[PDB]
Design an enzyme around this catalytic site. Sequence first.
Site, PDB file in Angstrom:
ATOM      1  N   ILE A 141      27.978  38.625  24.337  1.00  0.00           N
ATOM      2  CA  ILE A 141      26.861  39.136  24.824  1.00  0.00           C
ATOM      3  C   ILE A 141      26.582  40.388  24.080  1.00  0.00           C
ATOM      4  CG2 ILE A 141      25.403  39.577  26.697  1.00  0.00           C
ATOM      5  CD1 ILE A 141      27.368  37.990  28.316  1.00  0.00           C
ATOM      6  N   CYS A 142      25.395  40.658  23.430  1.00  0.00           N
ATOM      7  CA  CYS A 142      24.887  41.910  22.772  1.00  0.00           C
ATOM      8  C   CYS A 142      24.132  42.678  24.013  1.00  0.00           C
ATOM      9  CB  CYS A 142      24.060  41.749  21.674  1.00  0.00           C
ATOM     10  SG  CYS A 142      23.598  43.235  20.741  1.00  0.00           S
ATOM     11  N   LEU A 143      24.910  43.385  24.776  1.00  0.00           N
ATOM     12  CA  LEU A 143      24.315  44.342  25.642  1.00  0.00           C
ATOM     13  C   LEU A 143      24.999  45.819  25.581  1.00  0.00           C
ATOM     14  CD1 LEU A 143      24.494  43.743  29.293  1.00  0.00           C
ATOM     15  CD2 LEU A 143      23.120  45.510  28.229  1.00  0.00           C
TER      16      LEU A 143
END
Lengths: 104, 148
Positions: free
Chosen positions: B83-85
């Site tokens: 996840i790109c967070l």
Amino acid sequence: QGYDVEFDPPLESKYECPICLMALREAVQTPCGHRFCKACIIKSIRDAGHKCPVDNEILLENQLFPDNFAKREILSLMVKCPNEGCLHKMELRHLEDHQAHCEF
Amino acid sequence: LPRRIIKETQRLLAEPVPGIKAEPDESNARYFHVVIAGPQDSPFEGGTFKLELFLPEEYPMAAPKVRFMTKIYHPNVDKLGRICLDILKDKWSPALQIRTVLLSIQALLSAPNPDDPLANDVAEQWKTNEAQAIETARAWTRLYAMNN
Ligand SMILES: [Zn+2]
Ligand SMILES: [Zn+2]
Ligand SMILES: [Zn+2]
């Protein structure tokens, strides 16, 4: 490394350390207005960087200052014995005299 | 187990994030089984999405590790479930909590961030073919996030 005991009423967030989630122990405050346990913020500074974890403001060790006012208030908060059996509650500063001053 | 972790766990179970189920593993308290309901009004509506969250030994000095397990058509979730967070990468702070991560991921499902340098052939599809990408995320939802 803050105070790990249940307060009554519940500990107000204002006195909760954002690092350990316990009542501020040897409370210190930052120039940006945030409070932490002395040991917790020093650790955060050393392991997470020289910044206030709440707002990311630059934070240096020499900028941490004692918050004797908060410390005084916390020490006067009512707490309960850390074990079933006893029903007594006392100011946090008086828990010691009720820690090993019993039976087992 | 670190006192902070115990406290966060107790508080997450007592007062859970709406639409989010998150419980510690019975064999390892640093391992959380997470389930997020697809956001109402979003192309993921009606779906149930599973994720695994891991608290590294340095937590809270180090960010929790999160892997999206359920197949989803989203710009910020790769095929490897990464996840790109921001708060899981560069903007983590010991002041942030598991609840923060959970709430942030839930929001990501409602407001996809296709402003990625790649995010595979999903980011551009969401910007330069939004209508189709959305319908694809919808189909993937019924195909993979409806139990059965
Ligand atoms: Zn601050
Ligand atoms: Zn602390
Ligand atoms: Zn007692």
